[PDB]
């Protein structure tokens, strides 16, 4: 194989998914120069959960999925495997035996608007915490009250999604951070994504 990975389409695409509806891209049949990503000072976080980031160029991967979404800066701590809080509980869970990378960078000049960019949402409510790599799109009205509810709204009933209000004057931690999670599997199956060893 000789053609390079679509990392430009993953890391530089104009608009990312909302974290409740995190987008997945399958990477296959290509060369993956991870030194081009890892040497980049723009990533505020590049944490790997079953490999060293220096060794990624000496490995070949079974299948690779890149998961793309936007979150608040104080919530980037929740994307590590075994963490908990409304993002890890209700919209994006990693399994405790996750093998892969979490890569995150501040987007305040990209995702943040002087009137508030309300285009990005998270899941504020869910009957039960979601399973590893599940995604819940459903906008059924959540019921916090003891009585059942019907129609669009009620007392102690809530719309389950909430938008994040990103402004360029938000304090760091309330600014938007883009996340990419790379979720490969290693050395035990036939492989299709390759570090650039000849």
């Amino acid at each position: 194989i000789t053609n390079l990975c679509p990392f430009g389409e993953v890391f530089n695409a104009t608009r990312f998914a909302s974290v409740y509806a995190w987008n997945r891209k399958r990477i296959s049949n290509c060369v993956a120069d991870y030194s081009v990503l890892y040497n980049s000072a723009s990533f505020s976080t590049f944490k790997c959960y079953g490999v060293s980031p220096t060794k990624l160029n000496d490995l070949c991967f079974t299948n690779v999925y890149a998961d793309s979404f936007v979150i608040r800066g104080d919530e980037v701590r929740q994307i590590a495997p075994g963490q908990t809080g409304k993002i890890a509980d209700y919209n994006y869970k990693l399994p405790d035996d996750f093998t892969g990378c979490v890569i995150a960078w501040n987007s305040n000049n990209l995702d943040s608007k002087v009137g508030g960019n309300y285009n990005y949402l998270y899941r504020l409510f869910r009957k039960s915490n979601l399973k590893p790599f599940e995604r819940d799109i459903s906008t059924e009205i959540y019921q916090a009250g003891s009585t059942p509810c019907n129609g669009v709204e009620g007392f102690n009933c809530y719309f389950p999604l909430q938008s994040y209000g990103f402004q360029p004057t938000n304090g760091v931690g309330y600014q938007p951070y883009r996340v990419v999670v790379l979720s490969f599997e290693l050395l035990h199956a036939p492989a299709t994504v390759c570090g650039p060893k000849k």
Partner: antibody
Amino acid sequence: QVQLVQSGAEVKKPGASVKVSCKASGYTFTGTYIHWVRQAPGQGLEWMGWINPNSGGTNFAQIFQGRVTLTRDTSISTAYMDLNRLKSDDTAVYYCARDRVLYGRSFGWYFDVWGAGTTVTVSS
Amino acid sequence: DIQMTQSPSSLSASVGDRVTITCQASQDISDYLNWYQQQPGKAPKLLIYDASNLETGVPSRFSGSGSGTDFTFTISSLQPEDIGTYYCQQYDNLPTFGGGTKLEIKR
């Protein structure tokens, strides 16, 4: 090789309707908004609305709201603009244009890839 | 709405002259502006985006600057392929265009 290919010249009576089409190719059709922009003879550009080809959601400029309808057939990567109850000054070149796949802001519209434009003539 | 005005409605300029065209928004638009060129008989082309980010593969002579209500587009030395109408466009609230500035060659 990204491209937007449109229907040929349209000619219409007053009070009728027109169906311009925009066949996309060379990129994933669901990835970005398709805007509809028009240009009257010897005059400036005018944005009509957009369709998000993934969700089918649309937004219009106020002048066209209740006149323009935007739709899409994802099975043939074709976006459509339907304009109803046509008046003489709807005589214009109608373009579809894509909303920049990379390097922009997440809000911003742009118009990075444009179709060839379809002339509509509205007259008695 | 946000109404936009371009100061020269047309501007005659010689080959090798510096061209400056200014676009003013009625509201404060921060840096939410794009610039497009339309050569005679073609669809428009995006040249600058986000008020000053030069697009991929366009000539280095093209510049954009300013923020707030008042913005500029510039050609550092005009070349005879630059002749067309130049339009500014806000993106703060529904993408409105400006009236367009025609360039022409001075003779």
